[PDB]
Structure formats: C-alpha cells, structure tokens
A paper describes a structure:
RNRs produce all four deoxyribonucleotides and are the only enzymes providing de novo building blocks for DNA replication and repair in all free-living organisms. Class III RNRs, which only function anaerobically, are dimers of an α subunit (NrdD) with a stable radical close to the active site, and binding sites for allosteric nucleotides. Binding of ATP activates RNR, and binding of dATP inhibits it.
To investigate whether substrate had any allosteric effect on the conformations of the ATP-cone, flap, and GRD, we determined separate cryo-EM structures of tetrameric and dimeric PcNrdD, from the same grid, in the presence of 0.5 mM dATP and 0.5 mM CTP, achieving a resolution of 2.6 Å from 1,105,348 particles before post-processing for the tetramer and 2.6 Å from 1,132,695 particles for the dimer. Both forms were almost identical to those seen in the presence of dATP alone, and no CTP could be seen bound to the active site. Two dATP molecules are bound to each ATP-cone and one at each of the specificity sites, giving a total of 12 visible dATPs per tetramer. The tetramer reveals an arrangement of two dimers (chains A/B and C/D, respectively) in which the ATP-cones are all well-ordered and one ATP-cone from each pair mediates interactions between the dimers. Interestingly, all contacts between the two dimers of the tetramer are mediated by interactions between one of the ATP-cones in one dimer (B or D) and one of the core domains of the other dimer (C or A, respectively). In both forms, the C-terminal GRD is highly mobile in all monomers such that it cannot be seen in the cryo-EM reconstructions. While this allowed us to build complete models for the ATP-cones and analyse dATP binding, the role of tetramerisation in the inhibition mechanism is unclear.
Numbering used by the authors:
A (entry chain D): 1 to 103, 120 to 305, 311 to 645, 652 to 674
B (entry chain C): 120 to 305, 309 to 315
C (entry chain C), D (entry chain A): 422 to 527
Write the structure that this text describes.
C-alpha cells in the first residue's frame, strides 16, 4: 500500500487513511446532496492500493480529483478543484504577486491595480470599432490610456506670477502673497506638486529668473531695515539704489556707512543661496517619494543674475554628500544678443552653465535663434518680454504656435498624443520587388492609419471637454489661459481649444531598411525617402488641423513607455529579419542608431533638417571639459537645432 | 472628481473581492457578510501595511535620511528642522494607511533655537568687531522680544540677536502649519503633534 | 503598554483593528421573555463573535509578516523600534510584535 | 541567541531539557528489506517523537511559570535578566521567556 507521505514543507509523516476521508467529506457537505462513507470508502481503498510506498500531498490530491470526476458524482469534483485552486493562490501570495497576474510600496501597488482595472474597460466600452481594431493589431499606441476616463490633460507651463502676487486657495488651504525669497520657492514647489496630481504629464516653470527676481530686492530692503534699527542711522536712500551685482566681498578694512552697505548684500546672498539649495532637495525628494522642468537664462539684472548663479552653484555641489540630482530638469535659454557672445551681458553665467553640464548632467540648451522659435513681438527693453520666449519641458514637448490665439508658450499645454508604428507598415509591404508599387502601397496605408489616428484624437478631445472646472482646482483657476472667467460648475469647452494634439512615430532607420537596402544614416536615397514621408505626414496633419478645427503637430516620442511594446509583437508575427526585428528595441523616432558609428558632426548634419517638421517636440541627444559642451552648443547654433541635451 | 480619487476608487473596488474570497477563512467571511464584524482598511489588505507610528525625530535630525535616490544633511537651524519634520510625515504616509504623529515636539525642536541664536551673534561679531565669546552659553531665562528704546554697548547687541531668533522661529512655525494644511490639494495627510 | 518590552510610546503604532457590531446581537436576543435568560444568550453570542474576531486579527498578523523591509523604506530603517538591525531583504518578523491589535465596538 | 532580545549570555540560562532515544526507533525499523523504505519509516517515527517531546517541554514551561518570585529570592531579585522590576508576590511570566528549551539525543 502506502507507508509514508511527504508534506509540502518537507516533513515525512506516516500514512493516515482518516485524512482523505475527512477531506472528501468536507467537499460532500457543500453540495445539494451529501453522502455517507459508501463511496468515500471505495475511493480511499482505491487510492491506498496502487501506490509507490511514499506519496506527496499534491500527488494524493490529484488522485482524489481524478477519482471524484470519474464516478457518478461530478458535482463534488467541481467543488474540490475550485477550493484547492483558491488555497494554492492563497499560499502563493506570501512571496509573490499573484493578484496582479489574475488581473512594492503600497501606493505603487494601488496605482498598478487602478491602471490594470481601468485599461481594458476603456479599450472596450469607449473606443469606436475602427479605432479599437487599429489598436488591437499593433498599429497605434494611445499614451496614458489608463487615465482616459478621468478627462485629463497632459501638461502646462505655470504662470507663477499670479500665484506669487495674489495667493492661492486650493480646497481648505489658502496662502497669501510672498514677501521674501524663502517663501516664493516654497510656493513654486507647492504649485508644481499640487498640479501634478491633476494631470498625467510633466510640470514646467517658464521664466524662472524673471518671476523670482522681484524677491531678491525685497530681502535686501529687509536686511537694510534691520541693519538701521540697532544703529539709529537713516539709510533710506539705499532702498532703490542700483546695484551692479550681488557679489560677496570680504568685510575687513572698512568702516562707516559704506561698510554696512556690504553686510546687507552678504546676508542677502547667503539667504538666496539657502533658498535655492532647498528648492533642489525638495524637488528631488518629492519625486523620490513628479516631472519638474525649469527654464531660464534670458534676464539681465542684478537679481536675476544672482538667482541664476546661485542655482548654478547649488546644482554643482549636488545633493547630500555630493550625489547628483535627477530632478528638477534644468534648461538654459541662449539667445544671440543676451549671453552668447563674449562681450554680452551674462557671458560668465553661460560659462558657469557650460561648466556645470560637465559634472552634473544639467542644464540642457534651448536655441532661441531657430526659425521656428523666433517671435516678432520681442524687444530687449520690455520688462515682460519673457512672454515671447519659447520654453520646453524635460519630456521633449513644444507648444508655441496657435491658429486662433497668440504665439506664446505660457499657460498652454498638451492635450493628448498618440504614436504610430511604421516598421510594421514597411514589413507588411516588403514582399514586392518593384520599388514604385511598394512605395505607393506604403503611402496608401499610411494615409489610412493617419486618418484613423486623427479620428481617435478628435474623439478623445470630444470626451476631454464636458469636464467641469471644479475637477481641476488649481489648473482651471490660476494656470490656464482663460481660467479666470470660468465658474466652478462650468464646462471647460470654451478654453480647451488652445492645446496641442501630438502624432509621433517610433523608428525610421528600421523602416528604410525594410524599404530600401539601408537606413538614412548610410544612404542618401533613404534619407530623401524618409524626409518625403515625414513631410507627407506633416501635410496630412495640416489638413487634419484645418478640417477638425484643432491643432495637430508631429512629435519625436520620448520612448519611455513604448521602448519595447512594439518589437515583440512583430517578432511573434513576422519572424526574425536581419537588421529590422533582430535587435530587441526599435530605434528612436528619427535619430541615428546607437550601433551605426558616427561622429557628432555627421550625426548633427543628418539629423538637423527634421526639427523643422517635428514642431510637436524634438531632441538632439549626443553621447560622450567645458570645451566639448561649448562645441556642441556651437554646432546647435550653426544649424536649426531646437533642443539639445548633451551630457 | 479629481483623477487621483477616481484611481483610488478603482483600486479599492478591485482589491476588496480578492481579499474576501482568497485571504479570509470561512467563518470570518460569514461574519463579514452577515453584518457582524467590519475590517478596517480591507482595501489595503494585499499591501502588508501598518496603521500608525510615532516618529522619532532625533534620529532623522541629528543624522540625515536616504530614501530613494535623495539624501539630506543634518539640520543646523530651525528653518530646516521644521521642513525635515514635514518631509518625514509626508513620506511615511505613503507607506502606511493611517495617521502620523510627532511626540515631544518641543524637546525635538529645542536644540535648534540655540543654534539659531549663535549665528546672529556671529554676524554681529563680523559687523561690529568684537569677541562676544561668552554670549554663546549664557543661560537665557526666556526668548522674549522687547523694543530697543534705549540701550548701549553689550546690551543692545544681545537683545537684537534674540529679536532675530524669535522672528526666525515664528516664520517657521507658521510655515509648518501652512504646509500641513495645504496637503488637501496635494486626501490630506493626517498629522498630529 | 507592552508585555515584552518597555512602556514607551515612541517608534510604536497599530498593526490593524476591526470593529464588532453589538446591536445586532441584542436585536437577535429580543424574543426572549425572562430578562435574565436574554442577557445570558447575548453574552454567549458575544463570546463567539469575539473569538472569531481575535482569530481574524491573528490571521491578518500572520499575513502581515513575510513583508520585506525594502517596501517600507523610511519606516523600517529609521522610524520603527528596532529598525537599524534589519536588512533590505529580511522580513520584519523580529520587530513586528511591538505593535498592537485592536478590537472595537459601536 | 534570543528571538526576542539581545544576543547576550549574561543572567540567562536553561529552563529544562529532555532526551530522545533514537536507537530504539532504528531497531523497530529493522525488518524492512528495502533500505530507502527503512529510512523513510525511521524519519516518520522520529517526527512524531519530536512532536511529543516539544509538547512535553511546552507543558512543563506552562507549569514552571505561575511561580512566585519569593520562591527564588536571589535568582529573581538580582541574578535574572528582567529582575529588579518584580514584586515578591508577582509571578515570573514576564521574564521567563528569555530562557531556553532543550531537545537532546544519544
Ligand atoms: N497524514 C496523511 N495521510 C494521508 N494523506 C494525507 C495526510 N495528510 C494529508 N494528506 C492528503 C490527503 C488529503 O485529502 C489531503 C488534504 O491534506 P490536509 O489533511 O489538509 O493536510 P495539510 O498538509 O494541508 O495540513 P494542514 O491544513 O493541517 O496544515 O492531503
Ligand atoms: N469548504 C470546502 N469546499 C470544498 N472542498 C473543501 C472545502 N474544505 C476542504 N475541502 C477539500 C479540498 C481541500 O484540499 C481539502 C482539505 O482542506 P484544507 O485543509 O482546507 O485544504 P488545503 O490543504 O488545500 O489548505 P492549506 O494549504 O490552507 O492547508 O478538502
Ligand atoms: N525643503 C527641503 N527638502 C529637503 N531637504 C532639504 C530642504 N531644505 C533643506 N534641505 C536639506 C539641505 C541639507 O542637506 C539639510 C540640512 O540643511 P542645512 O541646515 O542648510 O545644512 P548644511 O550643512 O547644508 O548648511 P550650510 O552649508 O548652509 O551651513 O537639509
Ligand atoms: N510651506 C508653505 N506652504 C504653504 N504656504 C506657506 C508655506 N510657507 C509659508 N506659506 C504661506 C504663509 C503666508 O500666507 C504666505 C507668505 O508668507 P510670508 O513670506 O511669511 O509672508 P507674510 O504675509 O506672512 O508676511 P509677514 O510675516 O512679514 O507679515 O505663504
Ligand atoms: Mg545648508
Ligand atoms: Mg510671515
């Protein structure tokens, strides 16, 4: 018969026939009709005989189920199997993640639960038939689909002046306008964190130096007032006294009323340094607990320069014990006539920026001299000229133009963006040996996929309106264009049509190899064909914008949540192809593949003429001494490069 | 109506049936269904979380903390200790499902009022060149602020430092309250002191 | 209080708690007409419900162990009682017992 | 070692210990012709004997507590770990779990 049973943990025990009987009985006492031991005895006798003298618990339960689903009582088997499976799932939850398979920080687990429970229901009940079929067959990717039922937007550029000047009331929390540098930075961090919860993208602050400039003078005035209180003097003429720069100088060797004109500047510099050092640590820890971007560089004043040189020296020492800071993402705004040439006003700040980018990976560089960035309403004497300087985010997104409004990049943002796979569009028509027919079929299918993605974006726009203003407290009261005439229970459809709808692509080297012998980085004809298809998409986007009364733009997708979710589903359907579906990850939107070795000059020369057709966003990533960064910035200046992120 | 609220509702509704059907016993489920017992925070059952903790602030103030990729040096004033306390209270809320409390607020924040008193004195020494080495550990009965209507020598150079220390602790005690109240927009963290 | 520690309210908290419905038991014990047998039946039901509640709390405690210290970064490195002698991959069994279990009523 | 205390060896000792006869279990498993079956039977009997021994040690532990500290003046006033916090009439339950239980073999 059977002598020994091995438990699950590993213990060895003697065979006990009164254990199978009591287990079958508890499955017979949960059905419509129970039974006495008439069949239990037969099952146990059959199991005990025909054994191996040593059996496991699972090896006995398998036999129990096999016997139960074989003798006239198939209703006890289906109660036995389900209970066994539930107990197995319960025991597998002590060291694994079974609950995610059925459908580490607790907040992350809850967010994953929400995303997984939301995605399929949106995929089924909200999308139309044609768009659903297009999405199913690995054609188009709808970014942040989990947040679809929450009629949410992507990002916005914060007009920090409103908050800093009038105060903000969000819920039961109200805050007055600031009066020094130790509160303006905190209020900026509060605004970023608050608006992050209301949108599924990043947060950016344009004109970082301009907004905080007025709060460097206030600290100086407070220090002067406190300095004249213990001496009984009268320093009323120093309040509006112009200052060349807030440079710290040693105090020894002076006396009188010119010695205390420097103590105030010294302590003002110290306070501004501490404030800018707290900003970085806060925006790093909050993310490590939020996509944050700050752009600055086009201010010429003693206060803006002080802020720009304190931030650029607190980002040099790093965080903690010298560690580099991942956030916030810092961007330098370079213009011809402000801080570029050696004789311009802020050349030393530019030199410091180039030095810091060689140790701490930041800042980036945004070129204001490009054709698509220049604005005609700019004059370097208006104190509010920052409204006409373009700003970008760390997520590679641009919103400058507008067909029914001003050409500004403040208080505007993205509404939605979707990505179109074109490598499959090339493999699906790789069979043809004649080039002309192959290209014609490629274009014919590209037209249809573009129409489908435009219809999907229009439908998502139609769903995103009908959202009450109260659902977004901070965004639709202080941080959007017309968000000052909207009642709490009023639809935002009267101001929603000021954002950007993005159409992106992933992979162009692969498409050309699946089309012609090589990619754009080796063959000129492939480069011409790629430029042609990009221009065709841009013209179709213009037609869509004219037809649907919206704004459409072409984007180079950042490839942060779509790096791999396009090539596995093509390997499983088309097989391994040399140089196309044999690398793991597709190459980026229009870059140069990381394996085709090139120099910076050739890469820049080939990749430059795409930025004029990628108005929705583009990057110039170069892998690698301040001289190297200076050369990179000069190379960007020589061409129409819009955004660069050399490290 | 806020997106975070909708996501949390989805997550809780997803979690509850799994807890009912896979993790509870048969006698517990019958009592739960027949309106006998109520299990608090059942939506957080799969996340093996705790409810409450009393924060020891001296550990994170004398030394620093390294959570994730961030780091922080030990506090050296009153305008950074009151911020590190907020950071700890907001960071530990996402790892539990209850409330956060700070015991002995006065004891924990006391050793930094004195450090604030020793920097204004240093600035005064740098301005009016003296030594002032005996003012550091002078036993102060109270940090009360009074007007400077008539003083001279080493008696108004010691009241001025007290005035500045009081003005710097007021602006941090109000910042603590404002920061803990404004977590509604950014459920608001349940905090006690 | 602590049966295996010191009377310290620092670095300690609650693990979980459940509440017990008392009024339903009293409504169930309402057809009795002796004023002395009714209270005895109420107590008999209350004892069983308390036993089930304690069993549920113990089972939740057993599940709450086997949790790695690395999914509670700040709590199990600085803020808990013995957190300092723990490693990221170790479970919190050795220090979890300083918390409390709660039985409620309404 | 200590699962609920520090890893010291001062003021700690042994509560009781019991020994298990292994040779008799092997003599009983001697008529089996197959070697692997013999070893499996030996382990099956050893597991049961270990369970009974642990039960006996736990029962003796339960009896050993509820002993007044007055019965061991010096030991429960100065020599034990948690002593000096105990009244003469208080039992030693709170400080008895720092000892060790012993299973032995020959
Ligand atoms: N001692 C045994 N002798 C024979 N078969 C056994 C024995 N123990 C378990 N089995 C087999 C046959 C039973 O139908 C089946 C159910 O096991 P069960 O008695 O619930 O044990 P278990 O390992 O789950 O223990 P527990 O639930 O008490 O921790 O396992
Ligand atoms: N309520 C029930 N309904 C149906 N079948 C049951 C029920 N209770 C027990 N059984 C059956 C299937 C089980 O595998 C067997 C023994 O029950 P049980 O000991 O609870 O299961 P188990 O061994 O899978 O659990 P565990 O892993 O928790 O020890 O009897
Ligand atoms: N808002 C904040 N969020 C997170 N960390 C912060 C914040 N503000 C300050 N910190 C950090 C910066 C330091 O690492 C630490 C202590 O600050 P602080 O007292 O200025 O120390 P320190 O030694 O760097 O000062 P200093 O060099 O200016 O004399 O707290
Ligand atoms: N961390 C914070 N979070 C939110 N609001 C804050 C925070 N810190 C300060 N505040 C609020 C408090 C005030 O309402 C507002 C401006 O503070 P502050 O610069 O001290 O000016 P004030 O109006 O209090 O001036 P004064 O104290 O001179 O009268 O910001
Ligand atoms: Mg510092
Ligand atoms: Mg104030």
């Amino acid at each position: 018969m059977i002598q020994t049973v091995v438990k699950r943990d590993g213990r060895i025990v003697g065979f006990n026939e009164q254990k199978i009987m009591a287990a079958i009985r508890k499955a017979m006492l949960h059905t419509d009709k129970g039974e006495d031991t008439t069949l239990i005895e037969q099952i146990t006798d059959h199991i005990s005989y025909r054994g191996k003298s040593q059996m496991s618990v699972e090896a006995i339960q398998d036999a129990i189920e096999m016997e139960l689903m074989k003798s006239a009582r198939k209703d006890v088997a289906q109660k036995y199997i389900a209970y066994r499976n539930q107990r197995n799932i319960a025991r597998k939850a002590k060291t694994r993640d079974v609950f995610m398979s059925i459908v580490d920080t607790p907040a992350g687990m809850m967010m994953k639960f929400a995303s997984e429970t939301t995605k399929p229901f949106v995929d089924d009940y909200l999308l139309s038939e044609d768009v659903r079929d297009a999405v199913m067959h690995n054609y188009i990717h709808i970014h942040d689909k989990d947040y679809y039922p929450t009629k949410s937007l992507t990002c916005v550029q914060h007009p920090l002046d409103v908050i800093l000047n009038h105060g903000f009331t969000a819920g039961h929390g109200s805050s007055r306008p600031a009066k020094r540098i130790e509160t303006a930075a905190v209020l900026a961090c509060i605004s970023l964190e608050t608006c992050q919860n209301e949108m599924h993208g990043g947060q950016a602050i344009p004109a970082f130096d301009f907004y905080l400039a007025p709060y460097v003078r206030m600290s100086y005035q407070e220090e002067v007032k406190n300095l004249e209180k213990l001496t009984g003097e009268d320093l009323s003429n120093l309040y509006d006294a112009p200052i060349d720069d807030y440079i710290e100088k040693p105090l020894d060797g002076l006396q009188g009323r010119e010695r205390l004109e420097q103590h105030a500047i010294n302590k003002t510099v110290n306070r501004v340094h501490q404030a800018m050092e707290a900003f970085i640590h806060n925006m790093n820890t909050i993310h490590s607990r939020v996509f944050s971007s700050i752009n600055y560089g086009t201010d010429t004043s003693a206060e803006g320069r002080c802020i720009m040189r304190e931030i650029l020296q607190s980002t040099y020492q790093g965080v903690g014990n010298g560690e580099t800071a991942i956030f916030p993402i810092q961007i330098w705004k370079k213009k011809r006539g402000v801080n570029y040439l050696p004789e311009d006003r802020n050349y030393d700040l530019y030199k410091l920026a180039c030095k810091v980018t060689a140790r701490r990976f930041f800042p980036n560089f945004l070129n204001l001299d490009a054709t698509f960035n220049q604005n005609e309403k700019w004059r370097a004497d208006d104190p509010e000229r920052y409204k006409w300087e373009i700003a970008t985010m760390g997520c590679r997104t641009r919103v400058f133009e507008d067909r029914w409004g001003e050409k500004t990049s403040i208080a505007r943002g993205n509404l939605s963006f979707s990505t179109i796979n074109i490598v499959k569009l090339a493999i699906e028509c790789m069979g043809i040996e004649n080039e002309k027919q192959r290209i014609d079929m490629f274009f014919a299918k590209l037209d249809n996929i573009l129409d489908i993605t435009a219809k999907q974006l229009d439908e998502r726009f139609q769903f995103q309106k009908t959202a009450m203003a109260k659902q977004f407290p901070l965004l639709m009261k202080y941080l959007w264009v017309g968000a000052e005439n909207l009642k709490p229970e009023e639809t935002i459809e009267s101001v929603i049509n000021h954002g950007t709808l993005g159409i992106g692509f992933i992979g162009l080297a692969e498409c050309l190899v699946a089309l012609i012998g090589k990619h754009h980085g080796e063959s000129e004809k492939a480069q011409e064909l790629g430029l042609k298809i990009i221009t065709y998409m841009r013209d179709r986007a213009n037609e869509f914008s004219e037809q649907y009364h919206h704004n459409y733009s072409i984007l180079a997708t950042p490839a942060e949540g779509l790096s791999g979710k396009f090539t596995k589903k093509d390997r499983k359907q088309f097989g391994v192809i040399p140089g196309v579906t044999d690398r793991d990850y597709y190459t980026n939107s229009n870059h140069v593949p990381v394996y085709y070795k090139c120099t910076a000059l050739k890469k820049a020369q080939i990749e430059a003429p795409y930025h004029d057709l990628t108005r929705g966003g583009h990057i110039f990533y170069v892998e690698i001494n301040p001289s190297v960064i200076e050369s990179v910035v000069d190379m960007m200046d020589k061409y129409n490069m819009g955004y660069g992120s050399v490290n | 109506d806020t997106p975070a609220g909708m996501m949390m509702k989805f997550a809780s509704e997803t979690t509850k049936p799994f807890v009912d059907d896979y993790l509870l016993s048969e006698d517990v489920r019958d009592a739960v269904m027949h309106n006998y017992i109520h299990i608090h925070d059942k939506d957080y059952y799969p996340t093996k979380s705790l409810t409450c903790v009393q924060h020891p602030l001296d550990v994170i103030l004398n030394h620093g903390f390294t959570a994730g990729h961030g780091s922080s040096r030990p506090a050296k004033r009153i305008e950074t200790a009151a911020v590190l306390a907020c950071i700890s209270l907001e960071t530990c809320q996402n790892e539990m499902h209850g409330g956060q409390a700070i015991p002995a607020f006065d004891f924990y924040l006391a050793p930094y009022v004195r450090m604030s008193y020793q920097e204004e004195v240093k600035n005064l020494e740098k301005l009016t060149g003296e030594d002032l080495s005996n003012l550091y550990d002078a036993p102060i009965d109270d940090y009360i602020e009074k007007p400077l209507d008539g003083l001279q020598g080493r008696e108004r150079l010691e009241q001025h430092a007290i005035n500045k220390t009081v003005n710097r602790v007021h602006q941090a005690m109000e910042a603590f309250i404002h920061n803990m109240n404004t977590i509604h927009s950014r459920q608001v963290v349940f905090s006690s002191i």
